[PDB]
Amino acid sequence: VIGTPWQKLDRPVSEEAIEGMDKYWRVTNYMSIGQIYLRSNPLMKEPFTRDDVKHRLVGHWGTTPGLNFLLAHINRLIADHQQNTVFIMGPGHGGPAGTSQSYVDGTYTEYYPNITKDEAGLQKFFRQFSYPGGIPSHFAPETPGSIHEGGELGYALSHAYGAVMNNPSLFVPCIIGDGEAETGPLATGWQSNKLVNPRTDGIVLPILHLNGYKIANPTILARISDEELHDFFRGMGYHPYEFVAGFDNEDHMSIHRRFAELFETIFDEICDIKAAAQTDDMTRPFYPMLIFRTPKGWTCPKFIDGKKTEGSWRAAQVPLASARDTEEHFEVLKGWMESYKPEELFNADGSIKDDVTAFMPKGELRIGANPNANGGVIREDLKLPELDQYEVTGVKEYGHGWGQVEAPRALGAYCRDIIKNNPDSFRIFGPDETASNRLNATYEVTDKQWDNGYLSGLVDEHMAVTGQVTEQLSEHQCEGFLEAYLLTGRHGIWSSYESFVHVIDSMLNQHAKWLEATVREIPWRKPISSVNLLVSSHVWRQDHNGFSHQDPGVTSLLINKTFNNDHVTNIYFATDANMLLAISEKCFKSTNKINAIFAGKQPAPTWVTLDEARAELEAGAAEWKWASNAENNDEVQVVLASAGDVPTQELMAASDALNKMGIKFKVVNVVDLLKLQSRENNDEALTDEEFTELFTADKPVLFAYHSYAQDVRGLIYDRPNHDNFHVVGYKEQGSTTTPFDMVRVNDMDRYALQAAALKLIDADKYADKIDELNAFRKKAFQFAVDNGYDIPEFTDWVYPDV
Amino acid sequence: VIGTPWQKLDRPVSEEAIEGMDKYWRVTNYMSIGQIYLRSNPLMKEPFTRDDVKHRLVGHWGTTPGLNFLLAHINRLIADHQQNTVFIMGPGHGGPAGTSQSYVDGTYTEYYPNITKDEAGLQKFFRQFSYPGGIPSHFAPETPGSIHEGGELGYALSHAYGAVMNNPSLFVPCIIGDGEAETGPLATGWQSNKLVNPRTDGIVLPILHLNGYKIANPTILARISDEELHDFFRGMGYHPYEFVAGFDNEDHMSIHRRFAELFETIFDEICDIKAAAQTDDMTRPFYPMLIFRTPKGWTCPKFIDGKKTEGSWRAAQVPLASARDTEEHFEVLKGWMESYKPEELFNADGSIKDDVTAFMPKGELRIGANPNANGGVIREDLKLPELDQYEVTGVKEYGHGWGQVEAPRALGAYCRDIIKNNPDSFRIFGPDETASNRLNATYEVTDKQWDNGYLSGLVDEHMAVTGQVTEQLSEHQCEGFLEAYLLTGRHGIWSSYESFVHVIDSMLNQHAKWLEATVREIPWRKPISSVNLLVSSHVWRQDHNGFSHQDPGVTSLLINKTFNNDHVTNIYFATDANMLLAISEKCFKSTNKINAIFAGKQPAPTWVTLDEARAELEAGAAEWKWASNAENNDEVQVVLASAGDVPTQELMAASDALNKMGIKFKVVNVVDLLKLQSRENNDEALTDEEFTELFTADKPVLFAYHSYAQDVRGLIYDRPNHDNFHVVGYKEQGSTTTPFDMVRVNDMDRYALQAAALKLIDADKYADKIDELNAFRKKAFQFAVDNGYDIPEFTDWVYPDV
């Protein structure tokens, strides 16, 4: 247990804590300005001149003094209540507030021993901010205390709420930009309080950093009427409190006492909510939220060159852009830095005085040191059930190509038992698609958690105020909740219709970048569980829907995060249920990855045994010798290669037909796509030798690919024999139609694959046969048109091994 | 002018209109069920049997009878008030409500003459829904009345609001799913009413289709308390009205009279708002919104097999899935269809009776016929200013590589004059980045439109209640507003930081698919203006930000919409301002496209004259002979090829160095990326002959690419000489650092490009030189570290022609 969760003070905040909070705010403002502006002389020792100012002034002043003020008060809170706390910095461009926090709390020097607590350390701390060889502009993963960089705005609330799930002792003050609040993802993030339980989960305190402005405009929320603003948050299930400061001549000490008293009223209400939830965990309470209204750039010069700067969008970037070049800007900078009175905050040796930090939390309650903000320190391996009990044994008993299994159902049973064995640290998310993607065997041991109104057992099924499945019709919520759940040391999976995974492409990009920086240069940030995404209900079999639901292209986005041997991205095609089981065990064991797991949910053949899936998954691509009819590679007339359940089914039917014509070929299945890249681009890929063995040194290769052919073509560009690959992929053809028609219009159906194989072998010799196959595809189509179902010869085909 | 906008009735709705609305609702429910279930015998003539039921039952019943009820009332409204109206179907899976609407209003037969108004037409109309060779499941662009397919949920409100911008006579009832309302984009879409003006823009009426459920869960908005629901919409600036029907035994006629009276109160308030705005266009009014609460699946059987179906998520997909296979499901279907009493709705010849449609609007006020729902019918070409006045003439007067121009500034001046010449039909959108991406010359002739509180001229600049620039910190809003603005026949552009364009990848996918279907098979849907997206503040020069802001990968997404010779997607790299001007003229003239226009905003050299940009843009890729030093292709030791402003600058510096070493090469610039693909994949690309002429038959090609190298490698896979291309792209390296460091860490800087060129020519011979260049890159880096700015030799370099 960290600290003493949810305890009220029952006395006023002491005047000593108020004095320490004002010193914190002044020292973090001073050091934030130092980080932005100063390359040397951090204490302004004589002579302090323009030569000490950075040659390239980059940064974001405006948000920062508001964050520094909140962080003083959140530190004071944590210390007085001993409260287990992780904050979210929505405006992650306020990086200096986050580095200054860690430097003040001591974690920065503990993690970065060269940045010492004295004048030499402080000089280095100032220069290194946003500087070549130094540290990023934003609250990056290399900053102690960060689980959210806040570079691409909008995910503050999904991350805050995902962090408190199954984390009942954890308090998350979530600082949200008022511009950020204009984004789609942030706007829906407010509603997460209908999806957490106040007994079994922790508590988020949203703090709207209502500083009036974004970069070059006011914000929507700052300029609507106060009555609209309050109705808005009340309508979303909060009790809104509002603090206003900095717009008049109120002295800073008074402002701190008034905020502290407010923040104690807010926390007391949170503690009341927490105590009440021990007895009534079914009534959803109105959680406090804080509207925090202060001037953007607070404490910087009010006017610069006749332009209003404090209390304006003009405070957003770097005030005094000429500070190095003109004595006029330099004099203003010097007076600004002096207004914090650093001679009271730093000892002569340049260490921050003890009376600045006596009010601060200590040990693991510190914001930089809490293990929830470095969740791999808390993470434990899942207690996984034995895989073999889930195997589809139909392949062993009856043959390769057996049955009509809906593949994700085996993964559902496996997830069900993972939740059973790990009852509060593995969650499932779905955007109203858990049952649709066939993972609902999980409801046998848990419920979808819903903390909002109930009506009737006639309609509410598998739903309770507490449970380990979460659904909301928002891919952004599912992805954001899951990410923070991983970042605080837990585990899980979500599922999406494949075309809609694109809604969160940009979130996958940011989490891949978090992983990239981490695996490369932050070894103190320990490994977290991987994002596991079941990409299902795919392009080939969106039977109730149509062309809007046909876009397998997240493959292509993911290929853009496969560099430097980071190995943070995996693209897997689950050929069948036994392959899916093998991939899933692997993904549930992995760490520091995004794993995109493609599987169809339609009734489909099972191709491999579980033991075979395990070996094949390891290699990445494998010959299926029981399906090949060639003796060796020299005999092979064409390589039949596929990735995806549907391309594989169609290739296999083509192979059966090609066999019967006396054509010689081998069958290669591809599961782990990026293992096709060269060793030069991927040091864990197939060697050229293994690749050549699979795909031959010079026979034609027909490659039936689940997604866009572009992907495979770009990936094998420097491989031996790549000029002989013919890649067939999805090509933006399709509608609401039968399963044969969908493969037909993309040249993916078995008859077109048989034709393409013939064309690659001898176009002249097989001209007639190619024609007959093309004519058969027309006939099968006319049959679907006239009759309303696909031709039996198509649908009724079973691989001859069965 | 269409109809008589914003007129009140001043009498009750007649009892004849109520009777016609009930017949409409019954006939559209009946035909929607017919579309889903029936392959033949649409009037249930003797014998009506299971053999008439579709073999594959696919569709979405639950939303549909709610949409049919609203559409009866919206038709009645349009007719009585003669109101210019386009509706949005958020739940686009309710396609049968939209096809039934068009069939009832007459447009379906006018556009589709084979689907006639009689028993044979009706049989064909039923069978073709969601059927091979037939029509889509959703409200697709081939349906008269659609500007929004609603397949990927969330964009209903940005589309509704973009449609009414500069459209003051237009009324848009926007039907929003209550599951859809859980998405990010929909949640922020509510706030658009702070960004429209009630005098100069039209009016959106959001109608929340609060049917209690999404696919397999209740919805958040249906289960919060009524007081939260109302506070929520009031807090977002609406006057909420709520209608509740269908949960008790109230007869249908009474329900219609009560709704009609409500809908007239709502419309009267909209007409009052419209009249008031003629005098006070500065006070933002509280626009009505309608909470419409009815049972999902309304009018279907209450229980099926002991399970509650009407008023449940179980109504979502296809009730009675066994209707063809069991007499039990068939009998239930038969009684359901009979409950609408079709013998009262259809004449003996199977035409819909005149008394079903006497209340309907006629002519161009019909929902299927309004030209705002087919905006290419209204669209006019922009009055474009002459391009030559914007040219950067520094290249002509001083030489290739001249100056420090911020390229988007020339596009800003051009946009300024486009707005001047087309003052109410060209808009700019930006996610708080218009000034940051340098398009702010537009503010010289217009303002950012902001209909929310003002404070002071000290902070509000270039902002007014009416204007043709719109900003909100939401890429989803900018993209959605713009799309509907184009779809209703107008024009514009938006700009985004390049890495954040990914936020709307999935919207680009849906609009590309809309374009695909349209160019292929909907010739009555006339061409609309193109989406023009200035992709700027790119990966190489995000000076105040860092790694989160480095992702040029929307190139890769866009490559996935380049099929079938649809030609709906363009990727352009603006080499400099004169190239940007030429690309922009082209894009502003184009139709039916998404145009992604890459340009850097940093101070940068201008390479080509405007006349040269015009010729080069047409070819797609061009040799720069004034920069090449080889005589002919046989002399060429390496092809220096680049795409993007920064890769080009670095390649050009490498060329200057390579020249001075006596290396022979040619320089090729690439602007129109997809023109690199083969003719087989792109019938407007460079021929093999032109390609070979640019890139040689067999010399090595060094290709410096702005984005991920994967893209170029996949694109040129079947081109002559592609095995000799070495593609250098962004490789997920970078942080907050100097401009040299950013190109350095991706091997993109001039010294690494010079080295790579040497390595391709003779690795052994140039081993030492390659070493010295590698060592110089280390030195330049150490210099940035020690000094705080890049080495003068790097920054001060100007191409020798200047």
Ligand SMILES: CC(=O)c1sc(CCOP(=O)(O)OP(=O)(O)O)c(C)[n+]1Cc1cnc(C)nc1N
């Ligand atoms: C850094 C950057 O690229 C910023 S900071 C900023 C203004 C944020 O204002 P907010 O009110 O939220 O925060 P404040 O500084 O505390 O006032 C924008 C638009 N941007 C560009 C941007 C655009 N779009 C998205 C999704 N994310 C970002 N980061």
Ligand SMILES: CC(=O)c1sc(CCOP(=O)(O)OP(=O)(O)O)c(C)[n+]1Cc1cnc(C)nc1N
């Ligand atoms: C069709 C499809 O793929 C549907 S329909 C649906 C439920 C919508 O419920 P809503 O309450 O909005 O509408 P209703 O039918 O009127 O009750 C979902 C989750 N989906 C999958 C889905 C997921 N995510 C997104 C962005 N879009 C869609 N279409």
Ligand SMILES: [Mg+2]
């Ligand atoms: Mg702000």
Ligand SMILES: [Mg+2]
């Ligand atoms: Mg609904």
Ligand code: NA
């Ligand atoms: Na090749």
